[PDB]
Amino acid sequence: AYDDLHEGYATYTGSGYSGGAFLLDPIPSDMEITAINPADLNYGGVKAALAGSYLEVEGPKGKTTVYVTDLYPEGARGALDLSPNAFRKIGNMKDGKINIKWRVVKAPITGNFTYRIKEGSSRWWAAIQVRNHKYPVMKMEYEKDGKWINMEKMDYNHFVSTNLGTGSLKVRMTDIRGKVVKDTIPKLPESGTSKAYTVPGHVQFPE
Amino acid sequence: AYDDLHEGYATYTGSGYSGGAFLLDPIPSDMEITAINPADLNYGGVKAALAGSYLEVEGPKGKTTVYVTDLYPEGARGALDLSPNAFRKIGNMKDGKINIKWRVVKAPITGNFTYRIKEGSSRWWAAIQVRNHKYPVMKMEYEKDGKWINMEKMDYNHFVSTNLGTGSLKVRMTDIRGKVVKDTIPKLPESGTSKAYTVPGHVQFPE
Numbered sequence: 510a511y512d513d514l515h516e517g518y519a520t521y522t523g524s525g526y527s528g529g530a531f532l533l534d535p536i537p538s539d540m541e542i543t544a545i546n547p548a549d550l551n552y553g554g555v556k557a558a559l560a561g562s563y564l565e566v567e568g569p570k571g572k573t574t575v576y577v578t579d580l581y582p583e584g585a586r587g588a589l590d591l592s593p594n595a596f597r598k599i600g601n602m603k604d605g606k607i608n609i610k611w612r613v614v615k616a617p618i619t620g621n622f623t624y625r626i627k628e629g630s631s632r633w634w635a636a637i638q639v640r641n642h643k644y645p646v647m648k649m650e651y652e653k654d655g656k657w658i659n660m661e662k663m664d665y666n667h668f669v670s671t672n673l674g675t676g677s678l679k680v681r682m683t684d685i686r687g688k689v690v691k692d693t694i695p696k697l698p699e700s701g702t703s704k705a706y707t708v709p710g711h712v713q714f715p716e
Numbered sequence: 717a718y719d720d721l722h723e724g725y726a727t728y729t730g731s732g733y734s735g736g737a738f739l740l741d742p743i744p745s746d747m748e749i750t751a752i753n754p755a756d757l758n759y760g761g762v763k764a765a766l767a768g769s770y771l772e773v774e775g776p777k778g779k780t781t782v783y784v785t786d787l788y789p790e791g792a793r794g795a796l797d798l799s800p801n802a803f804r805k806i807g808n809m810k811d812g813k814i815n816i817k818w819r820v821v822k823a824p825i826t827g828n829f830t831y832r833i834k835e836g837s838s839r840w841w842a843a844i845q846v847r848n849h850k851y852p853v854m855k856m857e858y859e860k861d862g863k864w865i866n867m868e869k870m871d872y873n874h875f876v877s878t879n880l881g882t883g884s885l886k887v888r889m890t891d892i893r894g895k896v897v898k899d900t901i902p903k904l905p906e907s908g909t910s911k912a913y914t915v916p917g918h919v920q921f922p923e
């Protein structure tokens with residue numbers, strides 16, 4: 510629609526395949542990825558607003574799409590830190606830094622959300638990650654007896670809250686376009702889970 | 717207190733031995749105990765200020781001493797809910813309600829404090845309870861590399877803080893008389909402790 514490009518500089522790097530901030534591991538080594546500067550990451554006042562998104566990136570030599578897996582701490586506004594397999598498609602690596610133009614695009618994925626329930630989660634406190642989302646997840650709310658509680662998004666790309674209640678958790682998710690989709694996670698453990706675990710989801714953002 | 721005085725009324729209950737609000741379990745069955753009204757409980761605006769304290773209660777037929785283990789939710793100022801073994805000593809069991817006078821007194825205990833580390837406590841969040849204190853515990857601080865941090869006392873008789881750091885924990889406790897002692901508590905887990913545990917203390921409030 511109204512869908513502005515973002516101008517900035519790209520560098521390249523080899524981290525982000527493992528141990529990146531957004532806790533999105535494992536990353537296939539053939540995957541084209543990127544680290545994003547803090548200002549653009551936390552769009553809308555949401556920590557990790559753009560975590561797990563995909564960007565289309567024009568360099569002086571071509572255009573390419575990258576999965577956003579990590580924070581680029583020392584990056585200026587507009588700055589991306591690309592994997593070299595991605596970088597090489599849009600610029601010469603002889604130059605260390607290239608002019609780029611990027612925007613958020615729809616993820617080249619299929620199927621539904623997958624939920625990751627962080628280690629330490631319970632009815633008392635929980636951090637919930639959304640994976641496999643066609644668009645940036647701006648918001649996640651759960652219903653506790655009648656009303657909708659907003660969950661804060663963290664730097665580690667999980668939505669977080671307390672006293673969530675017993676019983677299965679009905680949730681809703683909003684994307685960067687304002688689209689909202691509803692789902693249901695199975696009831697949380699009474700005592701904090703020693704291991705993080707996976708819940709296959711039943712919904713996806715609209716095309 | 718060395719001196720103190722409340723006027724109120726007492727009834728009696730069979731609860732507070734297991735599952736009380738102050739989480740002081742286990743409670744020996746033959747121990748004289750009481751539940752406490754919210755107003756006196758939260759003395760000086762500290763939630764559960766008088767939890768785990770001891771009171772001398774005077775009834776129409778004698779005096780006796782009790783351990784405070786539970787909240788008396790429907791209590792007016794000065795109202796107490798005694799265990800029968802305590803009630804039996806200062807009143808007639810044929811009454812459902814008696815006139816009483818009471819005061820916070822020195823604990824008929826020996827030895828130092830012990831600490832309870834609540835399940836789910838870690839470097840990031842801890843709930844720490846003091847047991848075996850001769851007087852009410854009004855304040856608990858810990859030292860976080862520079863200066864002292866105040867821990868919120870909770871309705872459930874643990875002091876709570878966050879981002880406490882790694883290593884062993886330098887604490888100072890303050891009683892209702894204004895008296896301050898200092899102790900150290902072992903290292904806090906990197907991730908949330910699966911079960912609650914007790915650690916021995918090495919300090920005690922002045923007689």
Ligand SMILES: OC[C@H]1O[C@@H](S[C@H]2[C@H](O)[C@@H](O)[C@H](O[C@H]3[C@H](O)[C@@H](O)[C@H](S[C@H]4[C@H](O)[C@@H](O)[C@H](O[C@H]5[C@H](O)[C@@H](O)[C@H](S)O[C@@H]5CO)O[C@@H]4CO)O[C@@H]3CO)O[C@@H]2CO)[C@H](O)[C@@H](O)[C@@H]1O
Nearest residue numbers: 628629633634665671701834835836838840841872907908
């Ligand atoms: O912060 C950056 C860092 O974070 C970590 S993950 C870590 C979080 O940081 C931390 O904030 C969080 O702390 C939780 C804690 O895990 C949770 O277990 C407790 S729940 C507690 C509850 O507050 C309390 O109401 C309750 O008391 C009950 C009692 O159980 C009962 O007996 C009676 S019937 O009623 C009482 C009162 O209602 O007891 C429960 C449990 O003891 O709360 C805090 C905060 O909400 O936990 C996270 C991990 O464990 C992350 O890994 C890093 O990447 C980040 O950099």
